[PDB]
Structure formats: structure tokens, C-alpha cells
Amino acid sequence: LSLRPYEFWFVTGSQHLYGEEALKQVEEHSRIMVNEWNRDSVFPFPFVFKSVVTTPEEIRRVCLEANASEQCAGVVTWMHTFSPAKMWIGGLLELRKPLLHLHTQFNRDIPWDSIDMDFMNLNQSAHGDREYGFIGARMGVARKVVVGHWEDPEVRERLAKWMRTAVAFAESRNLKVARFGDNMREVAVTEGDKVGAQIQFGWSVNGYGIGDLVQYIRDVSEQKVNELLDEYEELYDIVPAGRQEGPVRESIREQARIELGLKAFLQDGNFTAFTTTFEDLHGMKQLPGLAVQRLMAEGYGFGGEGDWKTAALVRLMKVMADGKGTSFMEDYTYHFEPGNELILGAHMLEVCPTIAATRPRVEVHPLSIGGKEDPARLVFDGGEGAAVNASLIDLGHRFRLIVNEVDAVKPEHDMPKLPVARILWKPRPSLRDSAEAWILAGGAHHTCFSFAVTTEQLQDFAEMAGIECVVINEHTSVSSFKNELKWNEVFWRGR
Amino acid sequence: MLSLRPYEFWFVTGSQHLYGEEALKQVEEHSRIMVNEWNRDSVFPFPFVFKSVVTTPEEIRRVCLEANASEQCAGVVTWMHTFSPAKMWIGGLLELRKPLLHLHTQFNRDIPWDSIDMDFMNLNQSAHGDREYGFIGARMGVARKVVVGHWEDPEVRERLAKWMRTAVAFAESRNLKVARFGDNMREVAVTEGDKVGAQIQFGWSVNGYGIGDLVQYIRDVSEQKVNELLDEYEELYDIVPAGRQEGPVRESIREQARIELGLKAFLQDGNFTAFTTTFEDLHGMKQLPGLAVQRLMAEGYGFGGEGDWKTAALVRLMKVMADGKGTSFMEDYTYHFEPGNELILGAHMLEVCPTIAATRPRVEVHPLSIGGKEDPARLVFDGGEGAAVNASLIDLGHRFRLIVNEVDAVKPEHDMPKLPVARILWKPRPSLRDSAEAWILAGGAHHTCFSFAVTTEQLQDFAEMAGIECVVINEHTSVSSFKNELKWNEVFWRG
Amino acid sequence: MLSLRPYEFWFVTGSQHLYGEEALKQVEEHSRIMVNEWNRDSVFPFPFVFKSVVTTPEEIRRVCLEANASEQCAGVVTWMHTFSPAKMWIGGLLELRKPLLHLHTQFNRDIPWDSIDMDFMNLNQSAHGDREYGFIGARMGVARKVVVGHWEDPEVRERLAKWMRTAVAFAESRNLKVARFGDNMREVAVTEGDKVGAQIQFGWSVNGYGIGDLVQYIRDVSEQKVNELLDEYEELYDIVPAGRQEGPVRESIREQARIELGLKAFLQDGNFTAFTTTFEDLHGMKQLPGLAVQRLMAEGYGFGGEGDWKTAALVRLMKVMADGKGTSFMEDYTYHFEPGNELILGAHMLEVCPTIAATRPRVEVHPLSIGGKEDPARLVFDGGEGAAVNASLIDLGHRFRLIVNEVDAVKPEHDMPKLPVARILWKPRPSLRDSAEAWILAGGAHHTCFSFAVTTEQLQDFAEMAGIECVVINEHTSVSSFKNELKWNEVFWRGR
Ligand SMILES: OC[C@H](O)C(O)[C@@H](O)CO
Ligand SMILES: OC[C@H](O)C(O)[C@@H](O)CO
Ligand SMILES: OC[C@H](O)C(O)[C@@H](O)CO
Ligand SMILES: [Mn+2]
Ligand SMILES: [Mn+2]
Ligand SMILES: [Mn+2]
């Protein structure tokens, strides 16, 4: 589910005070920085050099163009010299693309024996970026700030992680969610304000009768179903009974029809996320299962039981992660063994095979929920390692993003009677404390779990979106966490 | 140095009539003893003055009114020797406009175990008297400093002595007059601000004069007094060999002395203690004021370049705090990003105060294109080393913010033969990368006041007196926590 | 004289695909006709442009992005011809930074009783289309003007036409550059303020220049062109006898002419449309600018005395709103408390704009101690009579406030033979006693922009666009109610 071309504009500020020769050297430096940066494979997207800006209208022009350019996912600004910040007011007012303020310098060291006034006039980011820093503070602008020399690999790393965040934000602002049916009845956390979320994030969330999907599934080519099956047998282990013609293989075939119909519906409307609900499956043979797991592996967002917030979150985290190690997730049951406390996570069917440590198996088991026929699904153990588990909730007047850092662990025991894929994790700082903190913050039971997305990225995304992000990790004291929820509540009110 | 009027601190002791006249006599004896002993200690830069024990609403209100009327009263230190019902203090606390310090102390250090009786319990009961007083101060939201401990404790006296300087600085701030020769450097943002608001908040009087007003004073300087001033330059500094004899270079220095004497006459006539100039308005001037300003700063005049009246007032203020020691107008010019040796070179195009010099300053003449006037004479030197603060005061539009970075000034390892300006090298805490990110996030200015003498506590206590936010970047700072505190502070300080 | 770049107004029509392509065709036809006919009605001071009917989020966002980037687009007029599901408008409304007017109209005037059917109901359904759109605007809190009624109603067209003038003033304000020769008059409070906040809020660029910069331009004025300007003074005004032939009085008038040309040269070079002076800084000048200033204002330049950049910008933008008619810098000078005939005399020490003159201006030269310079030449005249507004824009520290008093200028019944400045008399509504008290409670400045042409509706619409409070004092004003509104308003505008 690939992306349109994206690029990041590098805008360098200066002034006319020091003359045209100085301005020539500023351009020279910026053009070199961009070219060298584009040689480093750490960057997942290209920088594009933009002509040095020195006047209010040049600044405003480049910001206007950045706004209109569909490929521009972010603007990186840097003051090479002093660049009087009132000139930047008009541009900053126009800019709606994500902004990163790079506070850097062309040379690494001070040339002690040669440094003169010309050098002082030229390489003065030391103060140019501070005057620019003030107008940003003064206008209350959303920004990432990165400090360091431009060849420092740590700097390039902040830059590169940020590019994925910005590109995720670009995808978020054009994100379309299709809902097949409404929320599970009586459920609170998956409910919320779609107009509010379209205003805040850009998400478009709209509802379709399950019957619209049923028609697409009905029109699937049997030839294509059979080819998809061949692919299933190539990628996965199939339960022995499904490896021969008969009713088990047919159950699998039916998920293949569902996958192909879903995919056709979604491509037709340019949707990149979707929801289903087991309470509305008229005309469907099975709850979508294996089909959904597959579409998630292709980069589609998904939320169960009408959960559009989590479907959008899964999709944008997929973009942040470059499609790696990311899944819709739900906390299912606990292991309270002293010293070995952990969480088993799953869903009734829909867990993405990209978090699998073992080769997935296609299985068919009964599912009473929904009252439909035994669904086919992929079954596997999730892998191990550091990860995040994130929830995005609607508090009524505003949204809150909640991020728990966790450590997935390998199971020490088989779970032979368990018909769904699953993963085990130990949340930080302990199961006891993270669960209390989560509950205090009203975190959902549905989350996006990811081995790839970092907390920095989710925080930066929250900065771009203008919403609160709270983090639960190894350093969390619960009492402090309670205090921060209160202090944050007063800041984010009316904002 | 620009000497101060006599200042003094009033010691007001609270009690009540409940225990009789003999108990009140003993209270007075203790207070008189504390004042007299305190004034024998050279740690205190200003004298304490015993005030008569107060026990009634009218006595309390009277002493507060008198403190407002007294030009020499720089602050009031209040101590409850006994219970002193705080409703009696309401009237006086509403009237009082001098800075207040609540000293929570006790006459005796130790409990006389084998003789302590009800009379002693009645008399030496600060333990609750100061708490009842503590309440009324919290209840009325009064600005105050609180100091706890025995009055012969050196740590207690230290806190008191430091606060005396802060309070004197506040007294100077309330009567501060700034003269601007010319407007802000065009298009610059951080040096702009609300002079009316600043006069309301701090008392600063900031008004503008045409550069021509200064030129007329420079024209009226007597040539005899100029010659004498060159003799002092000769005595005090290393003059460039070229200027040590008659000819162009010496005439370049003689011009700064003319500027110095014209400036001094202007300022003294208007009772100004700080001033600004701008390189964009130098009509009638031969040179940008340079040496002249450097000398004036060393005498204790506040200064801000490019029309910067906030930094000018900050510099005068901090000079008072520092008793004229080790304090300068400053600006971050260029960085040294050598791993394990990151530092900042600070300077200005001419105006850096010699009170921070480690080496004997040299008088030098070099071209300065900025301003388009004749080659100006200036002092050149390396800044000294050691712990320092770098502070800027910005206007956020609806309020002011004091930002303070604790730094470590370092001795240069190499010569800078081509650098025509005085300069200083420092390592900001907790690191270059972190302090600069925090500084930019706080929107701190490029222009600061740098000081080896002023402490963070003093700046904070100043902010408390002036009713503004003060934010500190030091070795303990984490940028993510710093970021939160800005948000939470902004909600408190709003309105 | 100082002329405007071309401006136009985009007409954006909303619909949806629901009813079919033929219906969309009928929608486009209606909108093209509306634009065509509006453009054939001389009440509009600027033309409308037809924009392709928008029906999808992408079409909406595109036109809003284009409006933003178009220098000549001064405003967007939106109308929902049919239901046009408002979530589609979110992306565009977030993007749009040009002034917005929501026109709630309908193509046909009357219900066609004998033939109205479902097709018609589907097509001509602004009645609910504009309500859903109204919702999203309230929901997102956008700045907007709403106008209701049939598109051929002359009252509807009049609201539209007036708003065009306001909106064009706003575009001018957004790009306004002020030059200040010298700083504020020392110790003065109301003319002080926050230039950064003002540039953020209004867009005004405000920067300071040494008087020496102006003096240099004055010295480079061609004596030829001075003489041609002097010729033009003779043509336009009654010059005082002693200034008619060569001599000291005519030399004085000649000096103002030099100031005039240097000032204009400087201003044009930086595209400045407003400026300030200060009598406290006149080094290298022979006179305080007087006659020169009066003439620059007459050309449409904004001016504020004593460093007053807020009034200078206000003067300029109200000139634009007024199309240069009957507008001036102004200051309340002295009162006439005669019972039943209470009035205010307004003037300045020199600088009153001749466009408010009811008599032919006289060029005169009198001494002026203020500033310590040579006797300045200036235009002297009586101001006109009639309905006017007197408006002040102040800085409360944390935000700006616009204060406008509706007044009636009156003709003097007596001469003022000893009075060496131009002046005007007015009777403030609802009374001198009450208007002055309300003004003081609102902290209104002593410097104002006075105008015979600018309406209260336009100042209010400008304030809406700029996101600032506008308070009005007029014939319906009760001081006690007005006092409450200051309180309630300040709670609304705080932190906003
Ligand atoms: O551009 C102006 C100067 O050259 C310096 O950058 C410094 O003075 C900034 O205030
Ligand atoms: O004994 C009465 C005194 O006033 C004491 O200080 C105490 O009881 C006040 O609470
Ligand atoms: O567009 C849908 C319908 O036709 C109508 O507009 C109305 O029912 C909307 O509420
Ligand atoms: Mn669920
Ligand atoms: Mn500077
Ligand atoms: Mn005036």
C-alpha cells in the first residue's frame, strides 16, 4: 500500500545586511548540506533545496508554496545568519505543513587562527536561530527543534525519524476510513466525535451498510479466489484438513473471497483504514478474519467493533513504522505470577502476522460471537523485544494519545487449545503500575501495538496534531502521572 | 562606579498583648540584640534597622505605610516572635509595596530542657506564630521570600545577605530610566515589546531621543577633558602602538573619548542609568559608540544594542545585584561543536564590558562595515573563566519571561589573532545541545546579560518581587520536563 | 491618488453529486448568471469571479488554496445552491486565509406554486444547504459575515458592496508598511504599543528611521519640481497675499513643498502607505511637516502625529474603506459646553486633511513654538457637516480594541480669525456628556481617524476579520450598559 512521493523542503534564512557575496556563501553551504544529506541512506525521503530567504515576501512565498505542494510533507528551517524575525511572521501564519527548526552550523569547529569579523557575520546561527526561536515561541507555533552539527549522525537520526512522523501526519490528513456497520452497542471508548477528529487530524470517517461490502464480495472472480489460495499455501502452513478439497478448505476459500471484495471496495474509494462489527454481518458467511489480518499486513488500518479511532491510529503508525511489526491489538487476560507478571494480547480473530515470530498457520475454529460460520484465521505467536502500545481516545472536548512502552516476551509454554494468534508482553514499569496509570488516563482496551514506532515519533505526531500525548514507561511514578494529567488538562482546555 | 543612595532593611517583629507587658519587653530585647549583632557581620551589604515590636492592626499598618514612604527602605524582614493574630496583619500587607522577606527564626538555638516552662512556651513560639502569619500571606497571595533557620546560622545570614542585593536591585529597577538613541533595529522581533507594560510591571521608564540630541552633547565636550580621558586610557589599557603617537589611529581613539564624555553628560543630566544605540541611526556620528559604551558599562550603566531596552534594563539591574562585578551585555556569536569540547563564543560587534576580562584590555581600531561609519576604537580581551549565569528577559505579548542559563565560562586554549572584538567562551549546562533546545523552546533572546556574580536564586527572587515567570536551565534540566513546565507555567501566569 | 492594485471577489457555489450531472449543470448555470448580472450592476466597487461549482473535499480545498495564493482575491463569497455535506468543507475552511462572506440566497425569488415538484425541491434547497454550512462555520469558529436574501434584492447587493470595501481595506491592512521618523512623544502612553502583536494581528509592518534619512531625501529634491509643486498650490488653494510674490512667506511655503517631495520619494521607495513624525526629533529639518502631511493624507497616506503608528495604520485603512473620501487624522482639542449646543472642536497642531474641508483651503504661515522650528506653512479651513465616525484603535496590553463613536459634524456659526489651524466641529452621539464618559471608560485615544464615508458596519466587519473587539458609541448607547459590555467582552477576547 505504497506512498505518493514525499520530500522535505530545506529553507535557509538570512538578511541583506552583509552584502551579496555573503549571501552567495550561505546558498553554497545550504546546497552542500542538502546534497550530502541526500547521499546518506539514513533518510527515508529526499531533502529539496529552497532558495535562501531574506525578505518578508520571500519567506511568505516559500511557505505558501509549501502549503500547496502535495509532495511537501514538512519544512526544515535554519537561520544561517541573523534573519530579523518579524520578516517571518507572515510566512509562519501561512504555513500548515509540519515545521522542524534545525539549529545547526556549517562548520563544526571554530577556526581559531583565522576567525575574523567576516566569519562572525556569516556563521552566526548561534544568534539567528535564537531570534527565530523567539518568534516561534511568541506565536505559539507547533514545532520540532533539533540542535547540533549537520554531519553529526545523532542529528541526522532525529531528522530521519521526524521525516517518518511528518509523512505519517501527511497521510493522516488525507486518511479515509470506511466503516462497515456502527460501533458495538453500549460501548463507550470506541465512540467519539468524527467532525472533531476530521478538524483535528483530517480523518474522514464515513459509514456503509454491510450490504455494500456483500455486493463487492459477490462480484469477486472465482479464478482470483483460487490464485489467492495458492498464495495462502505458499506463505502459511495450512491445517491438514484444509489441504484437501472439502468443507475446511472451503471455509478458507470464503475468507479469500472476503479479502478480495474488501480490497476492491477499499481501492475503489481510496480508503486506507476500515472497521467491521460482529453485530452486523447480514449476508456474510463469516466474520472477516484471515482477510483482515492480510489487509493489515498490506498496510491498512483496522479497528474492530466499529473502532474508527484505532483504525486511523493503526494506519498512521503503519506509515511511521514503514509497514513493520505493527498491529491492531487488545489486552485479553493476565498472568499474575509473582516475578513473571505479563499480559496476553489478541483479538477474536484480527491480529496482524507482521508481529509473528513463528510461521503463521491457517486454521478454522468455531466463533459463537456474531453467530456466523466457523471463520478461517492466521494463528501464530507474536515476537519479542521492546515495543509501544498506543491508544487514542476522545475525552469529549478533546483527544488524548496514550503510549505505554512494553517488552514483548517469548512464551515459555504452548497454548494448544487457543484458536487465535496472540502475543505476550511485560508493560513498563510493572504490570501493576502501568495498568493503574492506563486506567487513570482512561486508555482504551483497543490499541495499536508496534515493534517499530518510537515514543519520540508519537509525541512529535501529537505536537503536529495539537493534542496531548502522555507516556507510561520505566520512569513513570503513578502519583506524578496523576498530577500531569491534571496540569495537562488545564493547558489543553480550549485548545 | 555609579554609586547607590543609602539603602537599609527594616526588621519588623510581630507579637501580641496576651502575655503582658513584661513579655513584650523581652521580645524587644531579643529583636534589638539580633539587629545589632547582624550589623556587626560583614556578610551583610546593607544595615538592618530595628523597628518597634508591632502588636495591633494600627501599629502594623503604620510601619508598612512608613516603609512605603521611606526612600532608603529597600525591603522589610518580618518575624513573628510570638503568636500575632494575622487578621491584624491584613491592613498592613495590603498597603506594603516594599519587597517582603518572612524570616522564620527563633532567638535561642536550643531548647533549655531542664528549665523550659509555660513562660518560655509563651515567649519563644515562632514555631506557630510564623505559621499563622504564613497562612495570611498564602491567603492574600502576597509576593514573598521565606527563610527558615537560626539567626546565628551562617547559611541563614547568607540567604538574607543575597536577598538584600536582589531587593536593592529591585529598588533600582523601580526608578530605572533608559535613554534610547534611535529605534529598534528594523524587522527584529525579540527586542520589540510593550514599554507601558514594562513600566507597569517593573517601573522602568524607557523613552526615545533623536541621535542628534546626543551629537549636540558630543559637540559640546571640552577638548581638555578629552585629553585627560586619553591619559586614563593609556594608564588603564594597552594602546595599540600606532595610537600611542599622534596620527589617524590616535584620533580614532580620541573620538570614542569624545563620544564617552558626551554620553556621560547626557545621561547624568537626565538621571539615566541605562541606554541603547542603533547602528541604523548614526547621523552626525563619526563612529558607532564602542570603547565609549564598554567604559560606561564598566561604570555600571545598563546597555542594549540595536535599540534593545529590555536587555539594557536587565544589565543595569544585574549590575546592581552584582555590585558592579563581572557582568556584561552579551550575545552568542558562534559555536564550537568539537565532540567532548562543545562551547559558545560570545561577543558583540563592539560593546562587551571589560569587567569580565581575564587579560589586560587593549585599545584597538578596525573597520566595521555595519553602520557605514569610520573605523571604531574598542577594547579587546579574553573573558575570564568560572561559573556564570546568562539571562534574557523577553516579552511574550501578554506578559514577560525571565530565562536564565547557568554556564561555565572557560579559558581559551588558542589565540584568535584575526578577531577584532572582545569575546568570552562558555560551556552551557547541562550541554550545548540541551540548553540551546530549551532556550529556543523558551524563546530566549540572542541578547543577554552575562554575569559571574549574580546567582540564579537572586534572579528568581527578583522575578517573585516583580510578579513574572522565571525559568531556569541548569545541570539538572531535562528538556522534556522543561517543555511541560513552560506549558503549566503559562496557564498560571496567564492574566 | 495613491491607487489600488486590482482586486476581485470569488463566488464559490457548493453542491453534491447526489442529484445527478444534469442538476449540477443547472447549478453552474445559475451561478454563472448571478456573477454575470452582478458584474452588470454598478453598485459593486469590485467585480465578482465565477468559480467552478465544488462538490467534493478536494474541489473545495483546491479553490481555498488558490484563493490564498491569489494576490488579487480580496474575499470569497460562498453559497450552498443545494445540500453540500459540510464535512467536505472542513479541509478548505482550515486552509482559507482570505475574508469569508456566507451569502444565504436562492436563484429564483418566488416559489412557483403550480409547478413546484421534487426536482425543484432537490435543486433550490439553499434553505437547508446553507444551514448545514452555517453549522460547520459555527463549529469551527471561523471569522465570517452572513448575508441573507434574494440575489436581486438591492439591499442584499448593498451589504455585499459595502463588505467588498471592508475586505479590500483588510487586504491593504495585511500588507501595510509604516515608516516612523523618530520615536513616540516621550512619556505618552496611548500611542505606545506592541508592534510584533500588531503585525501578528493585523499584518502591519512598522519600522523606525532616523529623521536624518528623511532630511537626506529632502536635500535631493529637484528645485524644478519644487516650483512646479508651488504652482499647483496656487492652482488649488488661496495662498496668503505675502506668499504670492517672492519673499520670506513664499519661501516658507516652498520649504513645505520640499518636505512634501522628499517625504513622497522616501515613502514610494519603500512602498510605505503610512507614516509618523515627532516634533521632538526634527534635527536637520527647517519646519515640522505640515502642509506636506496634509497633502500626503489627501493622496491617501495614513498619518499619525507624535510617533503614533496605530492611528497612522487606522487612517490608511479607513481611507481605503472610504475610497479616499472625507477622511482625516484628528484629535479632540477643546469643548463648547453651551447648554443645548454642546460640541467638540477637533484639530491638530498642523496636520488636518483637506478632504474634510467645506471651504476652500488657505495656505497660511504662522509661528509654532512646539518643536522649536521655523514658522510652518499649512492648509487652513473649516470642516464639513453631516454624519461621521470617529474611531480609535488602542492596545490594552494583551490585545487590541477598536472604539468608534458616531457623531454629527456641524457648520460653525462664528468665525475663528485668530485660529491658525484647520478645524472641524462635531456633536457626538448620544451626547457630549455620555459619549465622552463612554470613550474614557473604554480608554479611547485622543488621536482618532475621522471619516464622513466609513460606516460603523464596516469597522465592525473589519474587526471581525482581524479577530479584535470593536465597541461602538452612538445614539442608542447607555453608559451603564456599555460599561457591562466592556466587562463581558473582555472575558470573551481574553486569551483569544
Ligand atoms: O545583524 C545584526 C548584527 O550584525 C548581529 O547579528 C547582531 O547584532 C544581532 O543583533
Ligand atoms: O496560648 C494562646 C496563644 O495565642 C498560643 O500562641 C496558641 O494557642 C495560639 O493558637
Ligand atoms: O441531500 C439529502 C436530501 O436530499 C436533503 O438535502 C435533506 O434530506 C438533507 O437533510
Ligand atoms: Mn475488541
Ligand atoms: Mn546584537
Ligand atoms: Mn496629538
Residues with CB under 6 A from ligand 3: C 18, 83, 125, 128
Cβ contact, residue pair C183, B208, below 8 Å: yes
Question: Grid coordinates 486511523 are at which residue?
Answer: A312
| Ligand 1 mean position, distance from CA A82 (Å) | 6
Q: For ligand 1, atom 4, which residue shows the shortest CA distance?
A: A121
Q: List C-alpha distances in Å: A415 to A375, A411, A423, C323.
A: 19, 9, 11, 83
Question: Grid coordinates 459463537 are at which residue?
Answer: A368
Distance from the B94 Cα atom to the nearest Cα atom in chain C, whole angstroms:
25
Q: What chains are in contact with C, requiring at least 3 Cβ pairs below 8 Å?
A: A, B
Q: Kindly identify the ligand whose nearest atom is closest to the C-alpha of A276.
A: 4
Q: Which atom of ligand 1 is nearest to the CA of B308?
A: 10
Contacts of residue A390, defined as CB under 8 A and 6 or more positions apart, other chains included, come to A313, A317, A401, A402, A403, A404, A447, A448, A450, A453, A458
Instruction: Please tell me whether B331 is known to bind a ligand.
Output: yes
Distance CA A165, CA A185 (A): 34
Cβ contact, residue pair B444, A148, below 8 Å: no
To 5 degrees, how large is the angle CA B75–CA B77–CA B83?
Answer: 150
Distance CA C324, CA C299 (A): 8
Instruction: Please tell me whether A101 is known to bind a ligand.
Output: no
Cβ contact, residue pair B333, A108, below 8 Å: no
Give the nearest partner residue to A195 out of C68, C87, C200, using CB atoms. Answer: C87
The count of other CB atoms within 10 Å of the CB of residue B398 is 19
Cβ burial of A427 (10 Å; 0-12, 13-18, 19+) is: buried
Distance CA B348, CA B305 (A): 9
To 5 degrees, how large is the angle CA C477–CA C479–CA C480?
Answer: 120
Question: Grid coordinates 548614526 are at which residue?
Answer: B282
Residues with CB under 6 A from ligand 2: B 18, 83, 125, 128
Q: For ligand 3, atom 7, which residue shows the shortest CA distance?
A: C83
Distance CA A239, CA A32 (A): 58
Query: Which residues in B have their CB inside 8 Å of a CB on C?
Result: 180, 182-184, 186-187, 189, 192-197, 200, 207-213, 215, 280-281, 283-284, 395, 397-398, 494-495
Q: What are phi and psi of A175, to 5 degrees?
A: -70, 130
Q: For ligand 1, atom 3, which residue shows the shortest CA distance?
A: A82
Distance from the A409 Cα atom to the nearest Cα atom in chain C, whole angstroms:
43
Cβ contact, residue pair B192, C193, below 8 Å: no
Contacts of residue C365, defined as CB under 8 A and 6 or more positions apart, other chains included, come to C240, C242, C243, C249, C252, C253, C375, C376, C377, C378
Cβ contact, residue pair A85, B189, below 8 Å: yes
Distance CA C447, CA C468 (A): 19
Q: Which atom of ligand 2 is nearest to the CA of B18?
A: 4
Determine what percent of chain B falls in helix, strand and coil, rounding each to the nearest 5: 40, 20, 35
Experimental approach:
X-ray
Residues with CB under 6 A from ligand 1: A 17, 82, 124, 127; B 305-306, 349, 370, 446
Cβ contact, residue pair B283, C284, below 8 Å: yes
Mutate to test the pocket of ligand 3, among C83, C120, C123 (most ligand atoms within 8 A of CB): C83
Torsion sign across C-alpha atoms B301, B304, B310, B314: negative
> What is the residue type of A443?
G
Instruction: Please tell me whether A305 is known to bind a ligand.
Output: yes
Q: List C-alpha distances in Å: A99 to A146, A164, A411, C204.
A: 11, 13, 43, 24
Distance from the B199 Cα atom to the nearest Cα atom in chain C, whole angstroms:
10
Mutation target vs B (from A29, A86, A147; most B CBs, 10 A cutoff): A147
Cβ contact, residue pair B211, C210, below 8 Å: yes
Contacts of residue B438, defined as CB under 8 A and 6 or more positions apart, other chains included, come to B473, B477, B479, B482
Give the nearest partner residue to A113 out of B394, B417, B440, using CB atoms. Answer: B417
Contact assessment for residue A179 and residue A207, using Cβ atoms and an 8 Å cutoff = yes
Cβ burial of C321 (10 Å; 0-12, 13-18, 19+) is: buried
Instruction: Please tell me whether B348 is known to bind a ligand.
Output: yes
Q: For ligand 3, atom 4, which residue shows the shortest CA distance?
A: C122
Contacts of residue B108, defined as CB under 8 A and 6 or more positions apart, other chains included, come to B124
Q: Kindly identify the ligand whose nearest atom is closest to the C-alpha of A287.
A: 4
Mutation target vs B (from C194, C280, C308; most B CBs, 10 A cutoff): C194
Distance CA A397, CA B38 (A): 58
Three-state secondary structure of chain C: CCCCCCCEEEEEEECCHHHCHHHHHHHHHHHHHHHHHHCCCCCCCCCEEECCCECCHHHHHHHHHHHHHCCCEEEEEEEECCCCCHHHHHHHHHHCCCCEEEEECCCCCCCCCCCCCHHHHHHCCHHHHHHHHHHHHHHCCCCCEEEECCCCCHHHHHHHHHHHHHHHHHHHHHCCEEEEECCCCCCCCCCCCCHHHHHHHHCCEEEEECHHHHHHHHHCCCHHHHHHHHHHHHHHCEECHHHCCCCHHHHHHHHHHHHHHHHHHHHHHCCCCEEECCCCCCCCCCCCCCHHHHHHHHCCCEEEHHHCHHHHHHHHHHHHHHCCCCEEEEEEEEEECCCCCCEEEEECCCCCCHHHECCCCEEEECCCCCCCCCCCEEEECEECCEEEEEEEEEECCCCEEEEEEEEEEECCCCCCCCCCCCEEEEEECCCHHHHHHHHHHCCCCCEEEEECCCCHHHHHHHHHHHCCEEEEECCCCCHHHHHHHHHHHHHHHCCC
Beta strands C145-148 and C100-104 are: parallel
Distance CA B180, CA B195 (A): 12
Cβ contact, residue pair B189, A124, below 8 Å: no
Cβ contact, residue pair B284, C281, below 8 Å: no
Question: Grid coordinates 469571479 are at which residue?
Answer: C49
| Ligand 5 mean position, distance from CA B446 (Å) | 7
Distance CA A444, CA A422 (A): 18
Q: For ligand 2, atom 8, which residue shows the shortest CA distance?
A: B83
> What is the residue type of C185?
M
To 5 degrees, how large is the angle CA C355–CA C357–CA C360?
Answer: 115
Q: List C-alpha distances in Å: A391 to A180, A311, A312, A313, A332.
A: 22, 11, 11, 8, 15
All residues of chain A having their beta carbon less than 8 Å from the beta carbon of residue C205 are 56, 86
All residues of chain C having their beta carbon less than 8 Å from the beta carbon of residue A205 are none
Q: Kindly identify the ligand whose nearest atom is closest to the C-alpha of C122.
A: 3
Distance CA C262, CA C221 (A): 6
Q: Kindly identify the ligand whose nearest atom is closest to the C-alpha of A54.
A: 1
Residue-range domains of chain A with CATH: 1-174 (3.40.50.10940), 175-495 (no CATH)
C-alpha cell recorded at residue B455: 546567582
In the beta sheet, which residues pair with residue C470? C402
Q: Kindly identify the ligand whose nearest atom is closest to the C-alpha of A82.
A: 1
Beta strands B327-336 and B400-410 are: unpaired
Give the nearest partner residue to B189 out of A56, A105, A135, using CB atoms. Answer: A135
Distance CA B142, CA C297 (A): 51
Cβ contact, residue pair B336, A110, below 8 Å: yes
> What is the residue type of B68?
N
| Ligand 4 mean position, distance from CA B117 (Å) | 72
Determine what percent of chain A falls in helix, strand and coil, rounding each to the nearest 5: 40, 25, 35
Mutate to test the pocket of ligand 3, among C125, C133, C135 (most ligand atoms within 8 A of CB): C125
Resolution (A): 2.2
To 5 degrees, how large is the angle CA C144–CA C146–CA C149?
Answer: 160
In the beta sheet, which residues pair with residue A423? A345
Cβ contact, residue pair B209, C395, below 8 Å: no
Rounded to the nearest angstrom, the gap between the alpha carbon of residue C150 and the centroid of all alpha carbons in its chain is 28
Beta strands A72-79 and A7-13 are: parallel
Q: For ligand 1, atom 1, which residue shows the shortest CA distance?
A: A82
Beta strands A342-346 and A423-427 are: antiparallel
| Ligand 2 mean position, distance from CA B145 (Å) | 25
